[PDB]
A and B are shown apart, each in its own frame.
Chain A
Amino acid sequence: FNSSIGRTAQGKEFGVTKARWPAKSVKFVQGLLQNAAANAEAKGLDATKLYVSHIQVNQAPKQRRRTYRAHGRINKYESSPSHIELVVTEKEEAVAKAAEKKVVRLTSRQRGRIAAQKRIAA
């Protein structure tokens, strides 16, 4: 959601040109971050390996007002509120190893070739 916004030098960190400072959004998001850190210390987490594993924002129901336009017309003036959720997890070690067995199917010609190689070399 960035069309026709201004350009700035502080997007060089992220390789973009269009960046902003949405102060109200930052206030709400950092309040939720503080609440999640409080929930994590209440649950008894390490509080130093935490990274934000999940976050999403989607749309709440709109809040509507009226706008008065020329030649006596009415239009909408609607707020688009947000539902925000986020999950912080501890950063763990490497996940897993030891993949599937991968049972092999070989024809008689392939088996004879492998046996011939094993005989013909050491």
Chain B
Amino acid sequence: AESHRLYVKGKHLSYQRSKRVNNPNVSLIKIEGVATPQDAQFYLGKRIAYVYRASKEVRGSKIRVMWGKVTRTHGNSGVVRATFRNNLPAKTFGASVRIFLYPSNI
């Protein structure tokens, strides 16, 4: 067809933070479509990929991926907490990111 998307779009909002101290080890993700923790409970444990590009070709590609997963819900509005192998570079606040449907329970 014309669409081939097998993931859900999301936005990298910020780190986990207090009013004046942030914590880069936990990122905050807005998954689009979900507006409550009860709907966000479907997406727990799903893999997340941040997909970006670079000028230098490394192993056949100019596209590099950072992997992570959803761990828990955050707040009352469907924001989730996500942890990555290496933390997200904080210039990606507001950048798009992919939530895959695996590991599936359905």
Q: Indicate if A touches B (C-beta under 8 A).
A: yes
Report the nearest A residue to B61, measured CB to CB: A110
Count of chain B residues with a beta carbon within 8 Å of a chain A beta carbon: 2
Main secondary structure of the interface of B (DSSP, over half): loop
| Chain B min CB distance to A101 (Å) | 14
Main secondary structure of the interface of A (DSSP, over half): loop
The answer, yes or no, to whether B60 is at the interface (CB within 8 Å) is yes
Report the nearest A residue to B59, measured CB to CB: A105
The answer, yes or no, to whether A104 is at the interface (CB within 8 Å) is yes
Contacts of A107 in B (CB 8 A): 59
The answer, yes or no, to whether A106 is at the interface (CB within 8 Å) is yes
Measured CA separation A104–B59 after assembly (Å) = 6
| Chain B min CB distance to A103 (Å) | 11
| Chain A min CB distance to B56 (Å) | 11
Contacts of B60 in A (CB 8 A): 104-106, 110
Q: Residues of B with Cβ closer than 8 Å to A?
A: 59-60
Closest 9 CB pairs of A and B: A105-B59, A106-B60, A110-B60, A104-B60, A106-B59, A105-B60, A104-B59, A107-B59, A110-B59
Q: List 9 A-B contacts (CB under 8 A).
A: A104-B59, A104-B60, A105-B59, A105-B60, A106-B59, A106-B60, A107-B59, A110-B59, A110-B60
